[PDB]
Design a protein around this ligand. Structure first.
Ligand code: API
Ligand code: CA
Ligand code: CA
Ligand code: CA
Length: 417
């Protein structure tokens, strides 16, 4: 769970609290791209929005609806030895917190819901582009009138339709009255804890940016009904959502390696250092986004951003010796200390000063066929690189890797600028 909170802690109790959740199915990227953009680009000014951006992260990383089955059918009876039992208990504990008032659960679904059968694409069994409640009232909730909240949220969404077919409709599943499937799902659990709970389903027939657009409209609609004041730092239209999903300023940092751009990496990165004796899901990974991770695929390690494959690492596993903190380098004539794990911009040249116990391999530069070269003490320019070794499709970013005997001492990136 990630909090979207006011800057002043005193403002937290001055408006309601929403729990916002997505990615219970790992192949529903509208939901988890919307929670990601909410976390990256919105501000909550009073009250609180608690976000679980992706509920089923292992499944997200495999672009899969659910590696362990349907996680959204595990909120009623569940065996203690279900692989997702611990995750389910964390989510139930979040939902049932006294400080939570409302829950909003995001999904992507095929076709377009209609309250009467129109055809195979548009009918009551479809889930696309609807706003869903389990029943019209939850007595004892802070906001008992789920129907009124839903209808007003639907008004807000329908004021911004991209095409008339995308019109939102209310879907009340009347779950207590015999819907056996919905009785095992998240929002019914939430109403049984006297929370006002809602689900938003964006149509899978839409492109991703348009799915995310509708999810964000639903979030904003509901926040308005709850009177949780918020801002965002962009204009809510599909172009503008697309730009933020595909933002060139997005980065990932694996272990103690430097930050790397998410987008426009080469599709494969070779001889990529990773810490040995560490399971892939335990390798630290940091990002300015909230849906990034690593997953093993045969002997490669995939860098994922939601369902997007950003690169395939061909790793070699090695001890990460953390002793080396900085390196003396000359950058464009200017001698300086550069921290291990840095990215340095280079206009013209660089030069690595020799070190007693450290060997430097500039990846893409060579002066011989030596397998473990030391390339400190060379003045290096763009023209000296074999471009195929660049990190990036643009051929501007190169790795410098440092070694102390058979251990890895760190990496610095140079970016030619
Ligand atoms: N298409 C979704 C709708 C679930 C809606 C609501 N009951 C929730 O738990 O969010 C499903 O079949 O799981
Ligand atoms: Ca922003
Ligand atoms: Ca779903
Ligand atoms: Ca080299």
């Amino acid at each position: 769970m990630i909090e979207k909170a006011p800057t002043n802690v005193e403002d937290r109790d001055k408006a309601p609290h929403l729990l916002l959740l997505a990615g219970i199915q790992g192949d529903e990227p509208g939901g988890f791209n919307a929670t990601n953009l909410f976390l990256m680009h919105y501000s909550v000014l009073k009250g609180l929005v608690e976000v679980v951006p992706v509920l089923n992260k292992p499944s997200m990383l495999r672009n899969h609806r659910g590696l362990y089955g349907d996680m959204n059918r595990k909120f009623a009876a569940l065996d203690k030895n279900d692989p997702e039992y611990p995750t389910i208990q964390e989510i139930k504990s979040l939902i049932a917190k006294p400080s939570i008032d409302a829950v909003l659960h995001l999904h992507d679904g095929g076709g377009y819901y209609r309250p009467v059968y129109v055809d195979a694409m548009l009918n009551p069994k479809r889930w696309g582009n609807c706003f869903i409640i389990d029943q019209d009232e939850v007595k004892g909730a802070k906001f008992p009138n789920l129907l009124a909240f839903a209808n007003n949220t639907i008004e807000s969404i329908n004021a911004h339709l991209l095409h008339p077919i995308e019109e939102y409709h209310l879907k009340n599943t009347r779950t207590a009255q015999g819907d056996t499937e919905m009785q095992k799902a998240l929002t019914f659990y939430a109403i049984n804890q006297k929370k006002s709970a809602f689900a938003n389903e964006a149509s899978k027939e839409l492109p991703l940016a348009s799915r995310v657009f509708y999810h964000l409209q639903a979030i904003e609609g509901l926040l308005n009904q709850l009177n949780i004041p918020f801002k965002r730092d962009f204009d809510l239209n599909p172009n503008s959502v697309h730009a933020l999903i595909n933002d060139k300023n997005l980065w990932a940092k694996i272990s103690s390696l430097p930050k790397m751009p998410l987008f426009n990496l080469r599709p494969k990165l070779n001889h990529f250092p990773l810490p040995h004796n560490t399971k892939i899901p335990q390798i630290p990974i940091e990002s300015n986004a909230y849906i990034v991770g690593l997953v093993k695929n045969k002997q490669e390690v995939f860098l994922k951003y939601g369902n997007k494959l950003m690169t395939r690492l061909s790793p070699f596993y090695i001890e990460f010796d953390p002793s080396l903190e900085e390196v003396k380098m000359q950058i464009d004539n200017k001698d300086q200390m550069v921290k291990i794990g840095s990215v340095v911009e280079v206009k013209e040249s660089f030069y690595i000063h020799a070190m007693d116990n450290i060997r430097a391999n500039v990846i893409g530069f060579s002066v011989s066929n030596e397998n473990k070269p030391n390339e400190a003490g060379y003045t290096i320019k763009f023209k000296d690189f074999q471009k195929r070794f660049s990190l990036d499709k643009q051929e501007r970013i190169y790795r410098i890797e440092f070694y102390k005997n058979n251990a890895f001492s760190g990496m610095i990136l140079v970016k030619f600028v």
